[PDB]
Symmetry: C4
Subunit: 261 residues, 4 copies
């Protein structure tokens, strides 16, 4: 995108529709009460909603459908600061819309608080934030590892892997925090029910967890060594042509710094 | 099929048997009452019935086993108007038979209304139609994306993806409309119980949803640009030989229109 | 096997251990009462036991672990009459052992009738046999289609496909017949509890269903055309060397019959 | 590792974090009571936790996250005595930490005994040990078969296969022993609750089962013939350079023993 990338705006639309669908189906399947089979069912719904959407638009935008996941990819230097923000914008509006459309087609009484992420009475906000961190951490770690082109021919469906990771996060987390693992998914129910009690947990946990996962993977487990050069050349895009010059100032690592950053 | 395509009639048989099996097992596993674990179980049964059948005959006919899905592929210009109708005919008779055979081997009292798709009292037919649309939309979107030859080597089983998409549709939709997502599957229980109350919902929602999914994908997310030429040459078949002429009137894009449509 | 096939006896051992494990875990997870979540759990246990075993020994023996499945492969002309019988022998003793070892480590009271396949009071033995036929039919059809080397690169795990097919059979069938789909699995509980009431259903249904699936696939859906020559040369083995002769009586389709069957 | 293997210490970190996550999520999802849906949920949680972690770090360390599994690979001669011990050390501390972090963020009353593996009153410790053996045996067998580079292109995700094998172990075993299948996972709850009643079962069963699986596979089902030479050269590492000599004492199988072990 400094020339004819409709395959940037298609991805933005992907993230928008996938987030609407993700939230619409995730929240919709969470309406009511109950954890025994309630948890299993909601865990599977979110997991399968993600696996479905990652198959649907994973090849088009990477299927982030999650600000925390996009953030993970930003600090991981795999997308530009521009795409990230557009992705999150699309995801936030996408979620709100799905939550909206969900509200419009769902009978009251069943609506409840639209599956608003909520902490368990006996769980402090600090504990809940650590939980949300671990949930998103294993989640992002699974995303990075499975999206990683440098590995496996025995991966199977990465869409399912990621989805089942989300399911795992719910199977464990719902009892604690209803499992947010996704700012956008927590936001949607929040802004429509005018209730931001403890909402900070659902942005901070996933974001930190997402950051730790990106870190844990890229800077330790399976390093994806990138020089500050490429890193910066990533959160800004524009690569690698357009410049002027027949031989062009580009060559010979002679300590002359780098012939411009 | 203007010469020796038994691999058109084999596919028709595939769609017929798969629809019988699909409906037979889906309806059969839905007999009774209950949603908590009822939903999880029925959602999985349909999902696994589809994943099973898509593995079984997906390579033979594409495993549509769903008029709405076939319709999706028609407006998507991936099959002829002839195949589509034959597919739907096979699917409708296939479903009815499965529902029939199901009735014949199932004890009354347990038969109920043969898992007839039904709306929830607090859900208007308009809301129910929007639900059925979203259900089929994410469903078809998953089918198009996963069937798309232009993508992934990390897809895993597309049969499972599609099946789990169907499961997702049920995990969410059953509470609202019992989740139709398939005219044929709704039809079968309908024509055998002589009850078409709200049946319009189960044809309109999936069909519109299927149409929106085909559109959303082909004309936006991952465009499959086809000229009106090929499009029309698709819903009619007959390609590309038989014509007469040594050099044959075929060549030079000189604005002469197209040397016949 | 008319020279140094330890890779025939390894497969026999595979079928023996897999059947012991299959029955041991399937029956073990079925002990108790309950269908709501009972069915879901037992359906998954068998399905995952199979998917596990098909991954474990599928490359070694094809992981039949089921007389009906082996029978399916026999009439399908994919194995010799010798292997089939040895397979079934291994599977029958394998099952009995697993059921045995299961009994030995399971507390009474919980033992019940060792998950003996049983018909539902309101289900006639004729209806139950048709159910068992459809269960095994979709099952075998999934096995043939997924084992078929002539297809898909988007199959994902065929072990899971097959396993989930088994799960589907249970999700539907357990309420009717407890879902046998496997003579050996029905036999084991039978011979150890000295109860063969309706046992005929559990041999006849799967066998006929297995036969119909093999047929439905090979002689209709995706034909695997084999001349009576190869067919017979299959249920007898011994191919294709050993004969004597420099030019050897083998050649020229001149209607001379076939230079010996 | 007698030169610059950070890709030995990265794997150790992998095993450490994966074990923390594995135990953290497995134990966390097991807190409470109930088996009907309790079992299904806990079986899935562990299974999906493993499938997730095997995707996450399977390409980095083989994702053992289980002393018994590592032991299996040791006697299977696929890792050095050095790696094995470091792996188990990382797994044991990893588990304890996860159990620790779990305790710190979980409300009391819900903490119980931190999902300590426990035998069923009517199950003798001898029976329980045989159960744990079969659980780990089918588990390890699935791991060996699916990790085996010498097979399948239809494997799908080996991470899911392995995970579902673990789920199967739980679906069956939880009623008997709560299903340990992993010393580290049993240890963590044990050392933090100061309760080692019957703990011997949870080391002995998996270890023996793991040993039998490694054996059953490597020395029978699909032999991986290795000469005592390579075997020993494996549990010690250091291969194959560093030696001195232009032609070097290496060659001609003339019965001279082997030119040094």
């Amino acid at each position: 995108w400094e020339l004819r990338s409709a395959s940037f705006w298609r991805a933005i639309c992907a993230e928008f529709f996938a987030s609407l669908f993700y939230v619409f189906f995730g929240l919709g399947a969470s309406l009511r009460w109950a954890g025994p089979l309630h948890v299993l069912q909601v865990a599977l719904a979110f997991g399968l909603a993600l696996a479905t959407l990652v198959q649907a638009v994973g090849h088009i935008s990477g299927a982030h459908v999650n600000p925390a996941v996009t953030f993970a990819f930003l600090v991981g230097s795999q997308m530009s600061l521009l795409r990230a923000i557009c992705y999150m914008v699309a995801q936030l509006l996408g979620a709100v819309a799905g939550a909206a459309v969900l509200y419009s087609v769902t009978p009251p009484a069943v609506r409840g608080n639209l599956a608003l992420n909520t902490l368990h009475p006996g769980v402090s906000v600090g504990q809940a934030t650590i939980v949300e961190i671990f949930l998103t951490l294993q989640f992002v770690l699974c995303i990075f590892a499975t999206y990683d082109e440098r590995r496996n021919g025995r991966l199977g469906s990465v869409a399912l892997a990621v989805g089942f990771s989300l399911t795992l996060g719910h199977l464990f987390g719902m009892y604690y925090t209803g499992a947010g693992m996704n700012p956008a998914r927590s936001f949607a129910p929040a802004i429509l029910t005018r209730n931001f009690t403890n909402h900070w947990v659902y942005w901070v946990g996933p974001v930190i967890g997402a950051g730790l996962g990106s870190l844990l993977y890229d800077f330790l487990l399976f390093p994806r060594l990138k020089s500050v050069s490429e890193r910066l050349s990533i959160l800004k895009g524009s690569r690698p042509s357009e410049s002027n010059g027949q031989p062009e100032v580009t060559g010979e690592p002679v300590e002359l710094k780098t012939q411009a950053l």
